[PDB]
Nucleic acid binder design. Structure first.
Lengths: 124, 175, 111
RNA sequence: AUUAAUAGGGACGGUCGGGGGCAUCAGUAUUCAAUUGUCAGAGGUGAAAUUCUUGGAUUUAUUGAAGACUAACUACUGCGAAAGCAUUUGCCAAGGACGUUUUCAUUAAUCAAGAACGAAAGUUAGGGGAUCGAAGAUGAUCAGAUACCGUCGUAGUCUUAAGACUAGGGAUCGGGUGGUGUUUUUUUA
C-alpha cells in the first residue's frame, strides 16, 4: 504494501498543520512505513508540492529565520549579552550555504532580499 | 576533649597508611587518636588525657595538615618541637590562565629543580609543591622570609629576578 | 570538677601574642598576657622566654581569679597573613604544663 | 522531480556547562559607629629606621552600613560570541552526544572597510599648550531637556619615569595477541 496509502498518509500528515519532520517521524515510529525514499518513489515535499501542501519558504530557511529572530531576544533584553548578540550574528551566519545557490537553482526569488529585519515577519 | 579532623586526597590515604604504624604508636602515647577513616575518606585525631604537654593537640593539627598536603608525612610530621615549623601555602589562587599557571610553576620549579630550590635550601625549607599548594618545613625564621618570597614569586611578575634577589640576599647573609 | 574551669583565647602572631581570659561566656576576668612588655628587644618576644615570662604572671592572676581548667582557643592572624603563631603556642603549652592546668575542650580559634 | 561526501541545515526525543543571563542561599575577612580579659605598645622587623602611637590600638561581652568569595575535602575531571569561568535553589537567549530512509536539496566560500566586548602598577613633573576640550557656562520655559540649540578656559593636545659504536647483557618506552577477570560500554556501535 500500500504505497499509495503511505503517500496518502504523508499528504494528510502534511495537511495537518505540523512540521514534515514530525509528520514522517510519526509515520516511522507509529505506522511502520519505511520512507518516502522507499519503493513508493516520491519525496516528501515532492508529494506535498504535487498535493499543494508545500510551505512558502524552504524547509531549512523558514523556522531557521525564526530562530534568527529569536536569537536577538536576549540582545534586546540586555545589550551587554554579547554572547547572545553575536549568536544572532551567528544566526545571520546560520544563513550558511545555499540561498545565492538558489539564485541560480531557482528555488527562491533573487529579489527576495532575505534579512534579519524581515525574519520577524517570516517567523510566523 | 575535642578532635581535629580533615579529609585527604586519593593518594594521601595510601601514602599515610605506609607510615601509620609508628605515627599512631607515638600519637596515642601523646593523647592523639590518629586514625584514618577510609570509609569517610578523612583523618581524625582526638585529644585524650594521656598528654604531659598541651602542645600535642597543636602538633597533631599541624601533622594532619602536613599529611593532607600530599607531602612526605614522615618528613613533615616531626615539627612537634617548638623550633620546627611546617606549613602549606596555597598558591593556586594567584593565576587564572592554565598556560600562565604552567609557566609560573616552571619558574617556581626552576631549571632542573635546583635553580629555584637553592634559595629554599639557603632559607632551610623542605619545599614541596603539590597541585595548588606548596608545603615547606624548617625553622620559623627561615620559612617566614621563604613564604614571603614564595608569595612574591606567585605574583604575576617574573620570578627570575626574585630568585636572583633571593640568592643575593642569601649571599649577603654571610656578612 | 566543682566548676573550677575557664578558657584561654590565645590570639598569637609571628612576633606578638595576646591572651583573652574567658569562660564559656565572656566571664572569668583573670588576666591578659602582653606580647612585648616582658622583654623589649624585638627578638626575645619571638623567643619562648618572654612569652613564658608574661604567661607566668598571667597564670598567677588566673589562679587568683579561680579558673583551673583551661579550654584552649588557639587563634592565629589568618587571612592574608601567615595564619600561624611563632613560639607563643609552645610557650603557653609549656606554661600550662608547668602550672598543671587541666587539659580539656581544646579548640583552635584561628581564622 | 538523476544528484542526498546523511557537500549542509529548522527538527527529534533521552541527557548535559565552575560555559553564561538573572533568581534566591551561605559568609570566609575588612571599614566605621560600637565598645574593653579598665593591656600602650602593636605593623614592619639588613638588628634598624620606619606606619599607627596611650584618639583602645590582637581584641571585645556584635548590632548595621557595605563590598566580598568558595577552606582541608580539591581539583583543569571539565566547560569559553569572547574580553574567560570553582557549594545551594526557579526561569532563558542559546549551547550542547547521538539515530533518523525522518527536516529539505538548496540553509552562498573567504571578509578588510559597517557593527559586538576589546585585558599583565588608566602612575610621575616642566614645556608648545595653538584646532578644540567634558566638569559648568548662557538664549526658548515644554506641566518636564548637563545633550534640546550659539558663545569659554583645565586634566588634555604631545615628550619628560618607576669510534669505521666490534659485539653481547638485563632492565625502559610504545604496542599487540595465547589465556585471564572486570573496565571499555551495557544500540547511541
Amino acid at each position: 504494501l500500500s504505497s499509495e496509502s503511505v503517500i496518502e498518509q504523508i499528504v494528510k500528515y502534511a495537511r495537518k498543520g505540523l512540521t514534515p519532520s514530525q509528520i514522517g517521524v510519526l509515520l516511522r515510529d507509529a505506522h511502520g512505513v519505511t520512507q518516502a525514499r522507499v519503493i513508493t518513489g516520491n519525496k516528501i515535499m515532492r508529494i506535498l508540492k504535487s498535493n499543494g501542501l508545500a510551505p512558502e519558504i524552504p524547509e531549512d530557511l523558514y523556522y531557521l529565520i525564526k530562530k534568527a529572530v529569536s536569537v536577538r531576544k536576549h540582545l534586546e533584553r540586555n545589550r551587554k549579552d554579547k554572547d547572545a548578540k553575536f549568536r544572532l550574528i551567528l544566526i545571520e551566519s546560520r544563513i550558511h550555504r545555499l540561498a545565492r545557490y538558489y539564485r541560480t537553482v531557482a528555488v527562491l526569488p533573487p529579489n527576495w532580499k532575505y534579512e534579519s529585519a524581515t525574519a520577524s515577519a517570516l517567523v510566523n | 576533649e575535642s578532635s581535629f579532623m580533615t579529609l585527604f586526597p586519593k593518594y594521601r590515604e595510601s601514602y599515610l597508611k605506609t607510615i601509620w604504624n609508628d605515627v599512631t604508636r607515638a600519637l596515642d602515647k601523646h593523647n592523639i587518636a590518629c586514625v584514618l577513616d577510609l570509609v569517610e575518606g578523612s583523618m581524625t585525631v582526638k585529644t585524650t588525657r594521656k598528654t604531659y604537654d598541651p602542645a600535642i593537640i597543636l602538633k597533631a593539627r599541624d601533622l594532619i595538615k602536613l599529611l593532607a598536603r600530599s607531602v612526605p608525612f614522615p618528613q613533615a610530621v616531626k615539627i612537634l618541637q617548638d623550633d620546627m615549623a611546617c606549613d602549606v601555602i596555597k598558591i593556586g589562587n594567584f593565576v587564572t590562565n592554565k598556560e600562565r599557571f604552567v609557566k609560573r610553576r616552571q619558574r617556581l620549579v626552576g631549571p632542573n629543580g635546583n635553580t629555584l630550590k637553592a634559595l629554599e635550601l639557603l632559607t632551610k625549607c623542605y619545599i614541596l609543591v603539590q597541585g595548588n599548594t606548596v608545603s615547606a618545613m624548617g625553622p620559623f625564621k627561615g620559612l617566614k622570609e621563604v613564604r614571603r618570597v614564595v608569595e612574591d614569586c606567585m605574583k604575576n611578575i617574573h620570578p627570575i629576578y626574585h630568585i636572583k634577589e633571593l640568592m643575593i640576599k642569601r649571599e649577603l647573609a654571610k656578612r | 570538677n566543682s566548676q573550677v574551669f575557664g578558657v584561654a583565647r590565645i590570639y598569637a602572631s609571628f612576633n606578638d601574642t595576646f591572651v583573652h581570659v574567658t569562660d564559656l561566656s565572656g566571664k572569668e576576668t583573670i588576666a591578659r598576657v602582653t606580647g612585648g612588655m616582658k622583654v623589649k628587644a624585638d627578638r626575645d618576644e619571638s623567643s619562648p622566654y618572654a612569652a613564658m615570662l608574661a604567661a607566668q604572671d598571667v597564670a598567677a592572676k588566673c589562679k587568683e581569679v579561680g579558673i583551673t581548667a583551661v579550654h584552649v582557643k588557639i587563634r592565629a592572624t589568618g587571612g592574608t597573613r601567615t595564619k600561624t603563631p611563632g613560639p607563643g603556642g609552645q610557650a603557653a603549652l609549656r606554661a600550662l604544663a608547668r602550672s598543671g592546668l587541666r587539659i580539656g575542650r581544646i579548640e583552635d580559634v584561628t581564622p
